[model samples]
Target: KNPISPTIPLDRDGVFHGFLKLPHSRDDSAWGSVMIPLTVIKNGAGPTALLTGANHGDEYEGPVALHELAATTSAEDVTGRLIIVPAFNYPAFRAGSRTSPIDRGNLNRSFPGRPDGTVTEKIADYFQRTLLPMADLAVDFHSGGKTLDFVPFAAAHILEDKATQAACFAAMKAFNAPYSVELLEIDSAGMYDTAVEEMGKVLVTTELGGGGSSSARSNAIAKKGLRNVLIHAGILKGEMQLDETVNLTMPDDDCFVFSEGDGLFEMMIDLGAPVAKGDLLARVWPLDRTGQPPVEYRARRAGLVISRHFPGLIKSGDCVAVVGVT
Candidate 1:
């Protein structure tokens, strides 16, 4: 059967068969209810998979990719159950904002959410309680917010679960980015990794496109990764084609590039570029020329630039970049 959007109801046998209604807005004003598409195929022998996009509203590429995937693939062709939550942050998507305007909270940060908490928390709770528990694997799509730009990359939290770890590694290989980030040993103070670790589910997050616009190149790369994942999970039958030589590079530590002084920042290093110890990464100049010396930002260790500051402005105590050492 063809895939439908917004709430594909299921029968007792776990078939792709109903509609889940999501609250669209507080009041009726051309937008009242948001429906999400849910598809379940009781293949019985293959893994159940969940693919989510737009955890942040401004990240548009994932949702589009999923929509396209739904339109193209059928139930009989899939090897396992497939569930998709496009525009997880519906309000944010409508408002074109990163955080939910109603709750003013980041949905991604509020994972494994609260039943009595704000709207964002409730959404997170629904995913954790209803969706995640039923899936063998999950992939959350993300981007560098509306302001920052990022190179295509995939991230997975390292855990003790060997199966999960192996699945993550496989998914990263499917994504085919030369630079993949293994966020192991990093504190999950504000990420989905904490809940994913708790649930013991194989989860991978991909970042693509940024700066309030979608990149066609980034979207294509992300789509390729997702297709590869479906193939790996047995949800789709296709020959997997990925760069086998590209290994998942584990970072030794999280290197932070901070500002020495408050000023207008200018970055000299690009994201995904390699940096040596003591190499210059950025320079900060005073907003006004008052004979003040420009502060130079240098790499503390030899590593790859995984993330960089957007807008090129910095203040004391601001993090300018995060480098992942080999």
Candidate 2:
């Protein structure tokens, strides 16, 4: 049985605030519910758009931006249903973690979710089975969580359905972040983006600048991107002011750089910096040695630095850095 139920009238036109009532059985309360915030604004039918964020709770830029939009934008500004869920995984969002505390479920990786499953699973199921089918376009925003930082970029998946993929790319380009990436996820199985794309919805995810927190610039990017995407989807009314975004691609695994040993990591190149083949990317210093030289990590090829490990610390096999092709 589907566990999530919305409290608002989804078919009507005008701004309505509600929650996805997720059942929670805990030690303290046997009959309890977690109300995750959701909003819908609609007018005479045109095209519906689902905008969401906090897929990973630590990523706040998109959540804040989308929540603001939900609070401010009205049905009068939109042609069709505009669904907004800033904190998609509300438990994780409240705890400010990557996954839900109740089940350790990563909402992004728990797609096609079971109705009678865990809390996160129920959330995903509601989105996948119910919300997604009602939308023409969907945008789930993301930023690097606690472990990594990213250059501000709007991304579109390279799905097998070229028409859907092209439409996604178009929306991403219209998003107008500083970078636009034809992103290929290393693991697409059970992913939210994959499910939406598979269902033929125009889906565009994001990798806004990140460090477990949002910044002034990154927040602005998120806000602008949201407005632009709504315009691109033909659901929200406006002209998309596209910036000159560098188009990038991650063709294969070679673009990733992993730390071989754990220690303090100092990046040699800044995020968004252009690099040549064999450019020194980062160095890891030994914590216990007085005179031992740091281990060097280099770029595998010429590209732009799209992602980098956050903080000074690193662990063995950690993704130390990433490069993307222009």
Candidate 3:
């Protein structure tokens, strides 16, 4: 069994505020602890919706919305249950990093985790074995973090199960985040998305702005999408308040443009801009010398510039751009 334990009763029918406690033995204190805050709001029995934020600590929309959600929402407003975890990776969230400070674990990439593993893995294990099984529908919020930026959108992957895939797609539509995507993940193994999808649970994920911070626009989208998903799950009473969403798809690896060397990145195309297959997408100039010519990066697929490197300086293997077709 994992060492992480929750302080609140998850099954009870009321609004309970608590933390998932993990005991840590550090050098300074001999005995220290990590507390991951969570909120469970339940009424009469129905469907349970699991909402999470900060899978990567640098992302902000999810935590901002989930915190507000836990604070303002009461059990009376819920039909079944709402399990909200505002900061999924507490150490990483607190440290403003993409990975955990304690173990450098990328929670999103450590799913189906080991119980006896590090702090992040243990946390993942608990959710994989405990929290996820209790959920009927789930929404995990995400953005570009510090390294990337994206046009606000809700997304669902191409799954093998048709019914579950349909349900996930419908949930993304219900989210109505100005853009909806039929996504393709470059790497899927050990991911939370894969774990949840493997269980046949209807899941909706999002990229609602980035650059390691939150914006009023992105936060609004997150807040509305949160309620809309709950309403879609029949856990909340309301219509799906939707904005005009542009549907897009990532058909293949050709949609991704990866950097091969370290340099100063200059984006030629802006986010959401359409591009032809041969269109110039970005250029990388030598940072150490001035005489060398900047290497030009072109789009391999014809679509919109859905995502791009956020920082000016980039290194080898960085995802420089992502194109999505309508």
Candidate 4:
């Protein structure tokens, strides 16, 4: 049995908002606990969609849009149910860090969590056992966080189950951000995406604007994407209003550029720009001294620079940029 308990009724019909309490025994108070806020909007129950943001604490687009949905949406606007958790990692979200401050755990990397483990593992177990099983469809919002930035886009993975892959792609199209990706994750183990997809549920993830903040344009895209997914899932009653979405894919390892030496990074080409084979993408200058030549990073194939590392410094072995083909 999980130690976490929800304060609101999850199955009942109506709009209810409360927290999932996880008791903690720490230095501040022996009986203190962490409260994860959640909102459930249910009407007559057609389909249930689990919508979450802040899987990584610094990402803002998901939290911004989800908080708005929780605050303004009513039972009448939905056909089935919406389980919205703006900050999935409560401790990390509160601290604006990518991982939990208490346990230093990355929630996205701690899926299928344990009931008798760390605080993050416990939260993961609850969702893996309780929430995900109840969902017909799911969407976990993401952005580049403080370390990277991306062109606003919604993404779905290429699953071995062709039907499941197609359904996920459909949801991504329905999300209809400025861009849509047949995403290739560098690491997929223990991810929330893996947990949801393995259960045969359709999932749509996104990488909106990053750099640790949300802009008006990014938030607008998120707002529309959220409503669009619900409508596509038959959970929300509304017409699907879609924007022009450019499709992208990562062909192979050539699509990624890794830094060979730690230094000050100079992004030569901005995101969304077209590049041919061998085009200079970035340059890493030796930060320890001046006058020495910098290490140049270039495209291995023709593609678009979909994502890039932080604007200033970078370390050796860090991902400098990721390219995508149209």
Candidate 5:
């Protein structure tokens, strides 16, 4: 275990800003630190909502929306508290990549971490053990990053606890984006969503847009949704205004299409495209071979296309497309 500590304390009323500091060492220096920005806005007594973004570092909608919110929100406008951490995985966010450069840790996959572990783990541990226990609700922002792009949608998980899962679903509806999704991760362990759910707290997350950047449309949707969710949680003293959202479900693992070989992918279907069972979804062109016809991939069931591989490049196990029900 290395030596470090989290210095942000959340016991005050009004807007308090600070950084959660961690120890880091680079080639130029024997000692360095990673300081993550944090903002806590508290008013009177009510439920608290923890807003986080950039858990995957490369995603931009969350950073844009949450940082905007933190910069403009006043404690007087809050009925409860709003804990804003726009780039929780600070090192990754700064690097503009998906994992920490220091320890090669993906923060979203490093939950319930040890306090004395790597820099990323310490940050994760702080949130899982400290911030999460103090909040009544959480909303995490995400997108495809540089690897994928998705039809903008807010999502809730299918947790084992029916009541808590239902509660999370309710919160997802309140966040009122263009579409609301019920998503099941391939591996749920070590995720912030799973950690929050295991603690029986309401959590809502999003897969807005992708390709390693934010769009005006995605940011607008995220801004509106964040306000609506805070209102729904009674943290903000405003009515939750919702846009009518189509409910989408990823019924099972079959909903996803993965690449069979490393190559440059040719997506046959675009986001929001309608498809049927066995529909052609994409093709993989061999990166190292020529004069060979590309490998064809098909959809598993009838649904709408919601997500796909980005940058035109793919690895054998990379997700190519995901079909979701409306």
Candidate 6:
């Protein structure tokens, strides 16, 4: 009955491709139509897994990784239903902007969206009404926006459900990333992860790459993570290899490091570096001709640096890094 659902071939592996179209503005040139690509591949009668990327238009790492998987893998190789949506925010991606230029709305925030709402809301409505109902497991890929640089990490809502919590942990371990966080409450703006949790779906989010460019380090991490998920989901069967050193987990009450004063930030620690309580994390100096003595930014509690500021310019209240205390 579902238009997107195609007939599964008996002899050959099953591959069904379709697109969901969102209403466009009266002036097509002003606000273009939004289209979400859907790829369904059936290797056998196994569980279905959904992989999405590029919810934020400027973040290219996830989209690149999705494209790689779609191009390289075939239905024969995939055991269960594999759905890959390479670009979730079509408008943002087309305009190469972080938010939808039409309404200046963040697609990530407009989840389980409104049918009579803005363009972003309508797109969100499409996903909730259509794609999600078919997924048994899901993974949303993302990266820091243009302003922030972040080390690769995984996030999920672990407090809501035990199964989901276990799945999130499994995903982090499978991804083999050294850093993982259990986000208890996201900003009031909302996120796709929250919506996925409401649906009681097993989901995890990955943040990697930065500056709107794909880094080799991020790419390698993404490749391994994707393969690991597929293997874990039984979509692909093989001996999964994970680096033990690439395992890091954070508790709920980790202290987030922020800039204490407006200045140019100079870092003394790297991502994943251990820090003792009161250890110098960075120095903030006035960004003016005065060239005053830098104010040292120290760790409030002993932990590891999970994230760090990319550009040196810092502002008061700007989050510079996050420390996951033991």
Instruction: Give candidate 3's error at residue 274 in angstroms.
Output: 0.7
Taking all chains together, the TM-score of candidate 3 against the true structure is 0.97
Which of the two candidates, 2 or 6, achieves a greater TM-score against the reference?
2
Question: What does candidate 5's lDDT look like per residue over 1-326, in tens digits?
Answer: 33444455576788878876677677866787777888888888999888899999999999999999999999899988888999978888999999987789999889899988888898888888778999999899999999999999999987789999999998888888898899978599899989999999999899998999998999999999999888888778766776778889987889998887899889988898899999999999989989999899999978899999998779988988999986
lDDT (Cα, tens digit) per residue for candidate 3, span 1-326:
78888899999999999999888889876788888999999999999988889999999999999999999998999989999999998899999999998889999999989889999999899999998999999899999999999999999998899989999998998899998998898589988999889999989899988999888988999999988989988998867786798999998999999999999999999999999998999999999999888998899999899999999999999999999997
Q: At residue 305, what lDDT does model 5 achieve?
A: 92
Per-prediction TM-score to the true structure, in the order listed? 0.84, 0.97, 0.97, 0.98, 0.95, 0.86
| Candidate 1, residue 281: how far the Cα is off, in Å | 0.6
Off by over 4 Å in 6: 1-13, 16-18, 26-32, 184-189, 245-254
Better of 4 and 5 by TM-score: 4
Q: How close to the true structure is residue 314 of candidate 3, measured as C-alpha lDDT? A: 95
Q: Candidates' lDDT values, in order?
A: 0.71, 0.89, 0.92, 0.91, 0.88, 0.73
Tens digits of per-residue lDDT for model 4, 72-177 = 9989998899999999998999999999999999999998889989989999999999899999998999999999999999998887888888899999999999
Worst 10 residues of 3 by lDDT: 236-245
Candidate 1 TM-score to native: 0.84
lDDT string, candidate 1, 207-278, tens digits: 675666777777777788888888877788878767633233445544776676778878889887889988
Predict model 2's lDDT versus the native: 0.89
Q: RMSD in angstroms, all models? A: 4.4, 1.1, 1.1, 1.0, 1.8, 3.6
Backbone clash total, candidate 4: 0
RMSD of candidate 6 to the truth, in angstroms, is 3.6
> Residue 35 error for model 2, in Å?
1.0
List ranges where model 1 is wrong by over 4 Å: 1-7, 11-20, 24-45, 244-254, 260-262, 289-291, 315-317
Tell me model 5's lDDT, rounded to 2 decimals. Answer: 0.88
Would you list the clashing residue pairs of candidate 6? 178-248
Ranking of all predicted structures according to lDDT, beginning with the best and ending with the worst: 3, 4, 2, 5, 6, 1
RMSD of 1: 4.4
